Amino acid sequence: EPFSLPNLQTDEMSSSRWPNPLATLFADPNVAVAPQWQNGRCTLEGELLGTTPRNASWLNRFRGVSTAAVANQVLHLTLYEPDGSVFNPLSGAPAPEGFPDFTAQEYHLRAAGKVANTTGGGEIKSTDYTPALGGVKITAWDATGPSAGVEMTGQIESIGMENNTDFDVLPDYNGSAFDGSLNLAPPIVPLLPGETLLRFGTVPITTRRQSDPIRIISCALPQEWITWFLTHNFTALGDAALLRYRNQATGQLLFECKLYRSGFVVVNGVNVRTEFPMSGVFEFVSWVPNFFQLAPV
Amino acid sequence: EPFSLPNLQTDEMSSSRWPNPLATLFADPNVAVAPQWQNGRCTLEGELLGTTPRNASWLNRFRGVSTAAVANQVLHLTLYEPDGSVFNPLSGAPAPEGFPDFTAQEYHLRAAGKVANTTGGGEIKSTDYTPALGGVKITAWDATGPSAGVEMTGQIESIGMENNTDFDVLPDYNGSAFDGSLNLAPPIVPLLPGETLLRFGTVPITTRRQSDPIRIISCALPQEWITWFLTHNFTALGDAALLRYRNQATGQLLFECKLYRSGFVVVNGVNVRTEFPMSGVFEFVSWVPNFFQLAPV
Ligand SMILES: C[C@@H]1O[C@@H](O)[C@@H](O)[C@H](O)[C@@H]1O
Ligand SMILES: C[C@@H]1O[C@@H](O)[C@@H](O)[C@H](O)[C@@H]1O
Numbered sequence: 161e162p163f164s165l166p167n168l169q170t171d172e173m174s175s176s177r178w179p180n181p182l183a184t185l186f187a188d189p190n191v192a193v194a195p196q197w198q199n200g201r202c203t204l205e206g207e208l209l210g211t212t213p214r215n216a217s218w219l220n221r222f223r224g225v226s227t228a229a230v231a232n233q234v235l236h237l238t239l240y241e242p243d244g245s246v247f248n249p250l251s252g253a254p255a256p257e258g259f260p261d262f263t264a265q266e267y268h269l270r271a272a273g274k275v276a277n278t279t280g281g282g283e284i285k286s287t288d289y290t291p292a293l294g295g296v297k298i299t300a301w302d303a304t305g306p307s308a309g310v311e312m313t314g315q316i317e318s319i320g321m322e323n324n325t326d327f328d329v330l331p332d333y334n335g336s337a338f339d340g341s342l343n344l345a346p347p348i349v350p351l352l353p354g355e356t357l358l359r360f361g362t363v364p365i366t367t368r369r370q371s372d373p374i375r376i377i378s379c380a381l382p383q384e385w386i387t388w389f390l391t392h393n394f395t396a397l398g399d400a401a402l403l404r405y406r407n408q409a410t411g412q413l414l415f416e417c418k419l420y421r422s423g424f425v426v427v428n429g430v431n432v433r434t435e436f437p438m439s440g441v442f443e444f445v446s447w448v449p450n451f452f453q454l455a456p457v
Numbered sequence: 458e459p460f461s462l463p464n465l466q467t468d469e470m471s472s473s474r475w476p477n478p479l480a481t482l483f484a485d486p487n488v489a490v491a492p493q494w495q496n497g498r499c500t501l502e503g504e505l506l507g508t509t510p511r512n513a514s515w516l517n518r519f520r521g522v523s524t525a526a527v528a529n530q531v532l533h534l535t536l537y538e539p540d541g542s543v544f545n546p547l548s549g550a551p552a553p554e555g556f557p558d559f560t561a562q563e564y565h566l567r568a569a570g571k572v573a574n575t576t577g578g579g580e581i582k583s584t585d586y587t588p589a590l591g592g593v594k595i596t597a598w599d600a601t602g603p604s605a606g607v608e609m610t611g612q613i614e615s616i617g618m619e620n621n622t623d624f625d626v627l628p629d630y631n632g633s634a635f636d637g638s639l640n641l642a643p644p645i646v647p648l649l650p651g652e653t654l655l656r657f658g659t660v661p662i663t664t665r666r667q668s669d670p671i672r673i674i675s676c677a678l679p680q681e682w683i684t685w686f687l688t689h690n691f692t693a694l695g696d697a698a699l700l701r702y703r704n705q706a707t708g709q710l711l712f713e714c715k716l717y718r719s720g721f722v723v724v725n726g727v728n729v730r731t732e733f734p735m736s737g738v739f740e741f742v743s744w745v746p747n748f749f750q751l752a753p754v
Contacts, residue, residue, distance in 0.1 A: 166688040171540075174514035179476065180612075181514040181539070216513075216681070217471035217478040242478070243468070270615055276666035279615070313660065315477075317614055318567055318576070363610070365569045365576060373573045384513070387681060388688075391463040 163204070163394050163401060164444050165419075166384055169408075171438040173382035175362035176200030176212070177261065179219050184361035184376060187457075188433040194347040195328045195357075198254060198261035200379035201345045202423045204396050206389040209423070210345035213258040214390065216383050218242040220316040221258055222271075226306045227295065235271075235282060235301040237312055239294055249294030252343040254333035259291050262377070263326040264319040265368060269298065271314025278305045278312065283320075290335035292342060318365035327377045348380055348424050351399075351450045355426040358417060380424035389423075396421040398447025402454075405440045414440055415457045418448065429456020460501065460691050460698060461741050463681050466705075468735040470679035472659035473497030473509070474558065476516050479679060481658035482735055484727040484754070491644040492625045492654070495551065495558035497676035498642045501693050501718045503686040507642035508554050511687065513680050515539045515555040517613040519566075523603045524592065532568075532579060532598040534609055536591055544591055549640040551630035552588035559674070560623040561586075561616040562665060566595065568611025574602035575609065580617075589631035589639065618663035624674045645677060645721050648696075648747040652723040655714055677721035693718040695744025699751075702737045711737055712754045715745065726753020 173182050177200045198210035199219060213219055223244065224237035239247040239256050247256045260267060265286050272279040280303025288297040306312060321327075332338055348357060359378035366375045401419040406412065414436060417427045425442075434457060467482050474497045495507035496516060510516055520541065521534030536544040536553050544553045557564055562583050569576040577600030585594040603609060618624075630639060645654060656675035663672045697715040700722070704711060711733060714724045722739075731754065 166684075168684075168688065172512045174512065179514060181512050181518070215469045215471065215478050217476060221478065270662050272660075272662045274670060276670045279662055279664050279666065315614070315662070317612070363569075365567050365611070367576050369576065370573045373571055373575075384684060387463070387465075387684075391465065391681075391685075 161393050163397070165403070165442050166388050167441060168384055169439050169441055170360070170382070173384045175360065175377065175379050176219070176381055176383040176386055177379040178362055178364045178377045180362040180364060182360050182382060182438070183363055185358070185436040185438055186361060186434060187356040187358050187427050187430045189356040189430045190433065193328070194349045196330055196344060196347040197380065198330070198345055199258065200381055200386070202381060202386040202389055204389055204394055204401065204419070204421045204423065206392065206394065211253070211255050211257050211259055211261060212386065213242060215242060216387060218258040220260065221313070222256065222316070223311070223313040224295070226308055226310045226312060229307040230301060230303065230305055233299060233301045235298040235306070237296055237298065239291060239296065247294055249292060252341060253292065254342045254344060255291035260316060261330065263329040263331045264321050266320040267316050268318045268320070269314050269316045271312050273306050273310050273312045275305060278303055278310065289331055290333065292334035318367065320368045321366035321375060322368045324372070324375055350426040351420065352453065355418070355428055356430040358425040358427050399450040400448050400452065402445040402448045402452065403442045404445055405436070405442050407437065407440050409439065416445070416454050418452065418454060427457050428454035458690060462700070462739050463685050464738055465681055466736050466738055467657070467679070470681045472657065472674065472676050473516065473678055473680040473683055474676040475659055475661045475674045477659040477661065479657050479735070480660050481673060481732060482655070483658060483730060483732040484653040484655050484724050485730045486653045486727050487730065488625065489622070490625065491646045492675070493627055493641065493644040494677060495627070495642055496555065497678055497683070499678060499683045499686050499720045501686055501691055501698065501716070501720065503689070503691065506720065508550070508552055508556055508558060509683065510539060510555040512539060513684060517557065518555055518610070519553065519613070520608065520610045521592070523605050523607045523609060526604045527598060527600065527602060530596060530598050532595040534593055534595065536588060536593060546589060546591035549638060550589070551639045551641060556588055557613060558627060560626040560628045561618050563617035564613050565615045565617070566611050566613045568609050570603050570607045570609050572602065572607065575600055575607065586628055587630065587632040615662035615664070617665045618672060619665040619668060621669055621672055647723045648717065649750065652725055652751070653727040655722040655724050696747040697745050697749065699742040699745045699749065700739045701742055702733070702739050704734060704737045706736065713742070713752055715749065715751060724754050725751035
């Protein structure tokens with residue numbers, strides 16, 4: 161069981177922060193504030209951080225129970241965890257596992273329960289996106305049911321998203337203008353100053369794009385790497401795994417990079433935002449210390 | 458290189474025919490006809506069958522280019538494959554990789570382009586679901602764009618589904634009842650007479666549930682097993698892998714089953730629809746011939 165990464169090209173993998181195929185691979189050295197994503201977080205030893213779900217397909221999924229019958233297009237849900245246990249809002253988690261970890265003007269959804277007139281679409285407005293409190297108020301809900309006390313399961317499908325930069329802004333999970341009562345995974349910061357976070361990007365469907373249509377949400381690890389770490393017994397024999405990104409078809413080595421053991425990748429010598437080809441495969445080379453300096457891209 | 462399966466519980470894995478977590482594990486010996494699913498199909502040696510996408514997150518996604526500007530809530534797309542190449546209708550494929558492989562009244566979707574005024578919702582009516590012909594007519598499309606010539610990407614999110622048995626009926630991909638020119642993965646049939654297909658089930662969101670409200674779509678392999686077969690170079694050393702399904706928490710061996718090398722699981726001795734616990738893990742035991750007789754559940 162020596163360390164390895166799966167043999168998948170970047171374009172054959174999926175985002176761990178929005179369910180969709182990876183579409184871009186890039187480093188942007190001019191980002192002013194480090195991201196503090198709560199999904200897509202996993203150590204190389206397979207320990208999940210933040211709200212990262214153990215089951216890949218619980219990302220952007222939710223379940224709960226109606227607290228009241230639908231009225232005036234409002235559906236209020238008391239939230240459960242994926243495993244159907246009750247989400248305890250006095251415990252300090254920001255949200256059930258897999259809930260969105262960024263700021264949006266609304267989160268559009270679909271949901272359904274065990275009876276027929278409970279399939280509907282709706283949305284959570286930003287001011288209602290307070291899942292740390294243990295429930296969510298869904299508005300613009302367009303089904304006639306459920307009545308009270310009914311299990312509902314659903315999916316967040318798209319967002320109203322005026323600024324692309326808000327994908328890196330944590331939401332006000334407890335509605336309290338941000339508290340240090342929540343258990344949040346720490347910011348993602350390269351351990352050497354010339355290093356830049358390598359971002360795995362995908363395109364979510366969003367509205368509110370009228371004047372700026374490009375939307376890109378980034379993550380630290382492909383979902384398939386998170387599952388790889390969960391299904392292997394890896395021991396980090398070093399601070400960081402030195403990787404090479406290779407076009408396996410043409411043989412061309414594109415760059416070397418460091419996969420830090422807390423679960424993110426960096427490159428060295430990036431002076432402007434730089435995109436990389438998507439048809440490459442990251443291959444493990446060897447274990448290196450944190451102070452190891454990479455060949456510049 | 459020795460055959461294995463990932464150490465995930467069934468409820469920690471995902472459907473390969475509808476993007477959602479697995480919710481049921483069951484065998485039904487009284488299903489009228491054998492399924493001929495085109496997604497979720499992969500041999501143990503990692504050969505994808507049917508329309509099964511290589512990238513997990515391509516399932517239920519589509520990409521194409523608008524044929525004309527939106528008018529009267531109609532958007533017609535000429536279809537592409539996931540890799541952005543043009544889908545070739547002469548090739549014999551029934552649809553681009555990842556397209557739905559079952560009959561429904563409507564396929565509800567959301568889509569968006571790189572430019573403003575292109576985020577919308579819509580649906581493909583059954584009579585318009587003829588992707589083998591190389592395009593799809595989306596109706597009830599609610600955005601003002603796109604114009605002609607614009608690349609659109611989207612996701613099928615729910616279906617109108619009056620009859621649950623239609624999940625096991627292939628759609629009329631080319632607009633007719635005649636599928637002889639189409640390269641279809643074969644029907645899934647156990648090789649020994651008392652065997653029953655073991656179905657991995659999830660709940661899709663559907664409308665039209667007034668007759669029968671329970672909706673369950675089944676698949677032959679969890680998506681994480683398909684990716685496992687792609688990322689390992691297994692050789693099939695016998696006709697079937699004998700597996701044991703074990704509750705790893707308690708230790709109770711629940712049943713043994715056969716994973717045939719063409720990519721599906723059977724159990725023996727099921728005489729009525731039988732559901733099984735979701736908290737177990739499948740473990741490889743040994744390679745066995747087609748006629749190896751399992752201990753009955
Ligand atoms: C109810 C509103 O409807 C449209 O304006 C969408 O663009 C917004 O995201 C919001 O959902
Ligand atoms: C146009 C129709 O609208 C509603 O009746 C849905 O329940 C149907 O599935 C279809 O989408």
